[PDB]
Each structure stands twice: as C-alpha cells, then as structure tokens.
C-alpha cells in the first residue's frame, strides 16, 4: 500500500543479446543500495535492444540510478553501464513505472578510491585528523583528452592518528587514464556535514578498463589549510550559482571579428577556476578584478564576495554595457591604473553622451569649407549615443540584492552598479544570508565603510527602482568620482535633499571632483552655502533635468567641465563658478537663458575651446547681457554658439571686450541688419577681431552688412554663410577678404516670400581664395562673368531665369574638376556634357 513497481527497457544509442540479468545501482536519501533483476527478451528494433526487466517492488519516492551491470548466462559482467543525465526515477504508490535505460556507445569501467596521507606522510600533525573524514569530492581528469569529471559526496569507509580510508561504492568512468586533480573532504556530526579542506592535487595515475573495475585510485590527502586563492575560486562559483550563472550570455554590443565567450566555465580543474572572462588575477592567483557586465546576471550577490579581499575593481553593470559590454570603448577597467588610464575611464561618460564638436552647428557649406582646409582641424562627426525617455529604465540585469560583505573589500578602488532593478535599502545594507558560513564569520569582524580608503570611483547608473541614493555613499572616506545619472526613480525633492546631504557631508563634500547627475529630475540646486563646501569639484553634468533655479558654488570652485544643457534655466548667477586652464567646451544649450552670463574673462591667458548657448532666449529682453558694458569681461573661447536665440542686435559686446573668437555661430536669430561699428569702434578695430575666420548668419532677416566686413577689419575671413536672409542686393563687403574660401547666400526672401536676389555679384571670379559659392534658390538673371576654374564648387540651381555661359570651365567640368549644381531646365550655354534641355 506504500510500495510501487519499476521495470527497465534497454534502448539503443546514436552487439549484446547474450545478457539475461541486470543489477541497477540506486540511491534513495543516502541509501546506496543495488538490486539484481532478470531480463526478458522480446522483438528487437532500431530503438530497442529487445530486453525488459522483471517488476521491482520499491517504496514510493524519488531514486537516482548511479549505474548498472548486464550479465550473460554464465553470470559474468557483459556491460558496465553509466546512468546518464536521465539518472532519476520516481516510484509511485500502487504504480508501475517503466524506466528507459539507453546503452551509451562510450565504453566505461568502474573505480574505487583510496585516500592516503601525502606531503606530511607521517610528519607534524596537520590542520585536521585524517580519521573522522566522513565524505569526499574528487575531480578526476582524463590524462589524454583533459576532460574533468566531478564525483560528489562519496562515503569514506575508514577501517582501523592513522590514515588510510576508502570509497567502497564504485563510480562509472569512461575507459582511459586519469589523475585525481582536486578534492574536498567533509566531517559529519549528527546531520551537519562540514568542509575540512579543498586542495588542488595530482594523484598517482590510474587506468580504467572497459567493463572492468579499477581498485584503490589515489586521492592524496594533504591535511592542510585551504589556500586563499582556492577560497577565492570557490567564492566565484558561489557568486555564479547565486546569480543564475548557467543562464549567462555575454553581449559584446558590437559585431566585429571576435566571437566572445558567452559565460564562465567551472567544468575544468579547480586550479583553473580563476581563468574566467571578466576576472583579473594577481601573480599568486588571487582575484583582483571582477566584472559581471554583459552577462545578464539575475539574483542576489551572496556574502561569498567578502572573501575576494584582493579585489581592486568590481563591476555589476556599466553605462556602456549595451554598447560595448565589459569594455569602455576599447579599453577595460583594470586593477592599479595610472592617473591617465583612470581619467580616460572617468571621461568615458562625457565622451559617450555629452561632448560634441561645436562646428557641427555650422551649415553643411561651412563644415565642408573647414574639412577641406588643411590649416584647420577636421570636424569630428557626432558619435554620441542618443538617449530617449523610453530607453531610460532599460535593465541589463535582474540583480535585486547586494551583500554588505562589500565592506570587507578594503583594497577596492572602483565599484560600478548600473541598469539594475534593486531598491536603495538592498545595496550593501545586510547579509545576503545571515546563516551562511561567510556572514557567520564577518558578523564577528568589525566591517565598516570607513576602511575602503582606496575607493575613489562609484557608479550608480540607471537604477529605476531606486527612490533615493543608498547610505553607503555618505560613509565612503575618499570618494572622488560619482555617477548617478538616469535615476528618475528619485523625485525632484528627494534628489535636492540627496545632493544637499552629499555637499554638507564632511566626508564626501570636500572630496568629490566629478559629479555626473544627468537625465534626472532635479528642479532646484541645493543652497549655495552647501554647494560652496564642494571645494574640489571639477566636473558637473546636469543635462536633461528640469532645473529652473541655480545656486552658486562661488569663484573658489574651479570647473574644467560644466554641462547644464536641456533644462529650464533663465539666468546663471554672476558667481556660479570659476573655470580651470584645462576647459575644452561648456554646455548651456536648450534652456530659457535671457542673457550671456558674465562668468568668463577675455583677459585670461587660457583660451577655452568653446561655449554653447544654442536654443535659448538671448536678446528677448532687449540686450544680450544683464550687466553694464563697463562691467562685461567677455569670453575666452575660440567658438561661441549663439544659434536659435532671439538676438536682434549683433553681439558687439564680445568683440569690444577683446574675446579671442575665431568662429561665431549666430544662425536662427532675429537680426535685420549688421550696421557699421558692430564689429569695430569708430576709428579703429577691436584687439582680436582679426581672429574671426568663420561667420554663420543663416536664418536671420538681414538686409545689409557694412564696411565692418572688409579686409580692413576681417582680413582672414575664410567662411561665411548668409543663406536664408533678406538680401535683395548682394553684400560684397565680405568678398574683400583675400582669404575668403567659401561664401553662401542661398534662398533670399522677403516677408512676402518673393525671390528678392536677382543680380549676380559681378567681379566675384577675381576673389583670390574663393573655392565655393552658393547662390542657388534665388532669381539670378544674366551672368556676364567668365567663370574661373579656381572657383570650382558653384551652386546656381533653382534660378529659373538665369542666363549663363560655362564654356570657360566646360573642359574642367568634363575632367571631373568642377562641381556645378544646376537644373537641366536652366539656360546654361556652353557645355553639352550637362544635358541641358534644348
Ligand atoms: Cl537683442
Ligand atoms: Na580573464
């Protein structure tokens, strides 16, 4: 009534039929017991060997088949069968189970082990007694094909301090030559089975023979302390098993010529467990780096991570994970980096999402002009990652918990968390399991965050369910770089509080150097008196927040980088901050700025690369600056971007203050003219006006310029674009420049949408440096000038009443040395190769 039945059916794989018995070896809750049954023969098939077993009465429950033996008429072992991966069978109360046994093509033999004292072969008593070893785990490695096999929880029968014991239950190994390469011994006390030691060894070579038993295979017991590097490798296996390791699949984020490894591997010799993708080791074999980035881990970080005390770089996610997996562009995060390597890695976020060449705000004409000019550096295409509101909150992993054992990793320099679903109270606040051998030990150690005096870099990027910053940040002694971008789980009120705490904290406040907090919800900056405490700040990213109110840091805070783009800032305090002699480009674009803030100095010996004030409301209040002309200090920057604003008056203020501007981008503004003394005083020139080589004035309402644009004021003027304006008469003043290489005046219209530009600029072919001209989409009529082969890029398309003869440049057009933009409908005489409609 408590029992059921089993029968076995022999199946073929992918000779026999002399066998008439089977001894199936099974295990049911530590009862390694075998039973002999007879074979009944039926019709053979290409799937069935045609042999079925007698009913076997067993008590209802789950059983695991270890192996089986087949026997002929003479009752000799005709086959030593392995269980396979279909090792389990469950007997049912009053049921009849039929188990399919598939005969493996690979010949197997059987083995027994003999545990022996080695190294301390009758010497100074070891870490534990040989006697009272109750269970062992042995790893055997095939000496030819190098395949390892793990034989777990074998019962050690010790018959008699003294030291010679055996594993009486035989195991099934494929025929070949082996060596024991590792073991774990256990002591049993009641029901508690405890670890004695784990060692990497090389036991004496044994050989397995087909359908025969090899007796007493060498397991060389050391009776020593488990080495720290072996403890590390076992912790890695724990971490891997706790974070759904079997289901990891590394994503490199790029299709190149490398096919990266998908996962870690523990089906190899124990001594090799430190060789893993993402794991970095020291000369003694200890773990110094661990990166789970790219694998897609799921689970809780166990207390076992506390063992890896030589860990210097630790990473669970990255802002770059979906782009380049484990890498930051081309380089990796490694232990003990130089100041240069560390800085390159810290600047990765900036390069990936914030910086861009300010000359990408110029027209295609002006960019082309610069790119084909060897006297100027080429314009770097926008390689940044565009990030939409839907892309934010996308997880790279399902890591829901971080053990507080992280407090034991005192040599830790850099820690990265990103794209995880954990809550702020689950980030290194508690033990993953208070009853783990690790937590039971570390509870008795005085573990504190105050000991991570080497941890300078922390990343908490895009953690959606994080409602505030975790407490561990405020207890870090030497924090320098912090990234908390895309934590839209934190409210505007909560973020202001968290930043205030961070600044007010006597630990971190005066130590923070880099602060990335873009794509968040901040509406107001913390109180100035608190922001002033951030004495060592050098980088600040507040892009894509909802910032409507700024507070100053003061002029004692010297910033190298400042990115305030995409917010709702109306004014920047005159004392917001100061800047270093290392500034490349500052971002203030996409705001509601009414004025250019007086926070720069044109009298500064260091010249910044650029200031970006595009997409604001400058000039909407009547003047481009809020201070007096006498108080205005100018801007020490080569490029000034003021496109998409409400500028009605040309910013003379910049030139009058001797600003070393070489490119001025004033496109998409409301100017109707640039009268005389806009770029100069009445009887002279401003100190640095001669540096102005590029001018973008497209999409304005300009009807006139002045003699301010002649070589007497702009002698090195190279590129100018006045396309989409209201010129009815060509402004020839810029053509006075001997250095003018490109000029554009496309699509001139009046308010009433008429094509107001009809006259060709007669004499333009004499411009000594002019290469490109754009006069397309106007109403150009007759052209009497003989075109020069020197001005070899000409756009005259969309001029329907044009009458021009191109005979002079006709052989150059044919030789592919002249680019003419035109319509086959236009009256263009002199070149048959053009295909003009006759
Ligand atoms: Cl204005
Ligand atoms: Na590695």
TrEMBL record:
UniProt keyword Lyase, yes or no: no
The name this protein goes by in its record? Leucine-rich repeat protein
Does Ion transport count among this protein's keywords? no
DUF4458 domain residues are 4-96, 109-213
Query: To which species is this protein native?
Result: Bacteroides thetaiotaomicron (strain ATCC 29148 / DSM 2079 / JCM 5827 / CCUG 10774 / NCTC 10582 / VPI-5482 / E50)
| Keyword annotations of the record | Leucine-rich repeat, Membrane, Repeat, Transmembrane, Transmembrane helix
UniProt-listed PROSITE patterns? PROKAR_LIPOPROTEIN
């Amino acid at each position: 009534s408590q029992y059921g039945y089993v029968q076995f059916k022999l199946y073929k794989s992918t000779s026999m039929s002399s066998a008439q018995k089977i001894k199936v070896v099974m295990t049911h809750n530590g009862t390694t017991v075998s039973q002999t049954l007879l074979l009944n023969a039926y019709n053979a098939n290409n799937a069935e060997y045609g042999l079925r077993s007698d009913k076997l009465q067993l008590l209802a429950g789950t059983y695991k088949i270890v192996g089986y033996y087949l026997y002929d008429g003479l009752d000799e072992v005709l086959l030593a069968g392995p269980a396979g991966d279909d090792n389990e069978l469950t007997v049912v109360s009053g049921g009849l189970l039929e188990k399919a046994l598939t005969v493996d093509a690979v010949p197997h033999g059987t083995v027994t082990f003999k545990l022996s004292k080695e190294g301390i072969s009758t010497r100074a008593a070891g870490e534990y007694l040989f006697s009272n070893i109750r269970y062992v785990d042995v790893t055997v490695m095939n000496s030819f094909n190098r395949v390892t096999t793990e034989l777990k929880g074998m019962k050690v029968t010790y018959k008699e301090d003294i030291g010679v014991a055996t594993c009486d239950s035989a195991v099934w190994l494929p025929a070949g030559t082996y060596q024991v390469v590792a073991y774990t011994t256990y002591s049993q006390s009641g029901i508690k089975r405890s670890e004695l030691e784990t060692q990497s060894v090389r036991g004496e070579s044994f050989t397995v023979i087909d359908n025969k038993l090899t007796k007493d295979a060498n397991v060389p017991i050391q009776l020593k302390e488990t080495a720290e590097y072996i403890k590390d490798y076992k912790a890695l296996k724990a971490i891997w098993e706790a974070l759904d390791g079997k289901n990891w699949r590394y994503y490199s984020g790029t299709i190149n010529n490398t096919i990266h490894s998908l996962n870690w591997n523990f089906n190899k010799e124990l001594d090799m467990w430190g060789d893993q993708p993402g794991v970095d080791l020291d000369n003694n074999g200890r773990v110094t780096g661990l990166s789970l980035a790219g694998f897609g881990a799921k689970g809780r970080v166990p207390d076992a991570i506390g063992q890896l005390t030589e860990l210097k770089v630790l990473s669970f996610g990255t802002h770059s994970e979906t782009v380049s997996g484990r890498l930051f562009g081309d380089e990796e995060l490694t232990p003990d980096m130089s100041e240069e390597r560390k800085h390159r890695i810290r600047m990765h976020y900036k390069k990936m999402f914030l910086d861009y060449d300010q000359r990408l705000n110029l027209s295609d004409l002006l960019q082309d002009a610069i790119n084909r000019n060897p006297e100027m550096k080429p314009i770097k295409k926008d390689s940044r990652i565009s990030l939409k509101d839907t892309q934010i909150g996308n997880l790279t992993n399902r890591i829901t918990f971080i053990s507080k054992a992280i407090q034991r990793l005192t040599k830790l320099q850099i820690i990265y968390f990103a794209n995880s679903p954990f809550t702020y109270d689950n980030i290194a606040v508690d033990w993953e399991d208070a009853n783990s051998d690790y937590a039971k030990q570390y509870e008795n150690e005085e573990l504190s965050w105050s000991n991570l005096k080497d941890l300078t870099d922390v990343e908490l990027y895009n953690c959606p369910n994080m409602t505030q910053l975790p407490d561990f940040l405020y207890d870090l002694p030497e924090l320098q770089s912090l990234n908390i971008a895309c934590n839209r789980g934190i409210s505007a009120a909560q973020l202001k509080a968290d930043w205030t705490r961070l600044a007010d904290d006597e630990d971190t406040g005066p130590k923070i150097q880099i602060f990335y907090m873009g794509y968040n919800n901040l509406e107001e900056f913390p109180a100035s008196a608190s922001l002033q405490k951030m004495v060592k700040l050098g980088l600040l990213d507040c892009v894509h927040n909802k910032v409507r109110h700024l507070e100053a840091f003061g002029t004692n805070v010297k910033l190298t980088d400042l990115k305030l783009d995409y917010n709702q800032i109306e004014e920047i305090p005159e004392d917001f901050c100061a800047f270093t002699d290392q500034v490349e480009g500052l971002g203030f674009s996409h705001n509601k700025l009414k004025y250019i803030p007086n926070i720069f100095n044109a009298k500064s010996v260091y010249v910044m690369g650029s200031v970006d004030f595009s997409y604001n409301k400058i000039g909407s209040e009547g003047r481009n600056i809020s201070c007096s002309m006498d108080d205005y200090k100018g801007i020490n920057a080569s490029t000034v971007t003021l496109s998409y604003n409400e500028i009605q008056k040309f910013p003379t203020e910049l030139f009058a203050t001797g600003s070393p501007i070489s490119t001025i981008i004033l496109s998409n503004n409301l100017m109707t003219s640039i009268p005389e003394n806009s770029l100069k005083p009445k009887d002279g020139n401003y100190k640095n006006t001669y540096l102005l080589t590029t001018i973008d004035l497209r999409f304005n309402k300009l009807t006139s310029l002045s003699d301010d644009f002649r070589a007497t004021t702009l002698p090195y003027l190279s590129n100018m674009d006045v396309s989409y304006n209201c010129f009815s008469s060509f402004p020839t003043q810029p053509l006075n420049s001997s250095q003018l290489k490109a000029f554009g005046i496309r699509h001139q219209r009046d308010a009433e949408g008429n094509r107001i530009l009809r006259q060709w600029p007669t004499g333009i072919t004499t411009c000594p440096s002019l290469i490109q001209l754009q006069i397309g989409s106007n109403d150009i009529r007759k052209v009497d000038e003989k075109l020069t082969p020197q001005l070899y890029i000409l756009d005259i398309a969309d001029n329907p009443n044009i009458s021009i003869d191109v005979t002079s440049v006709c052989p150059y057009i044919e030789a592919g040395m002249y680019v003419l933009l035109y319509d086959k409908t236009q009256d263009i005489r002199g070149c048959d190769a053009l295909g003009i409609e006759r």
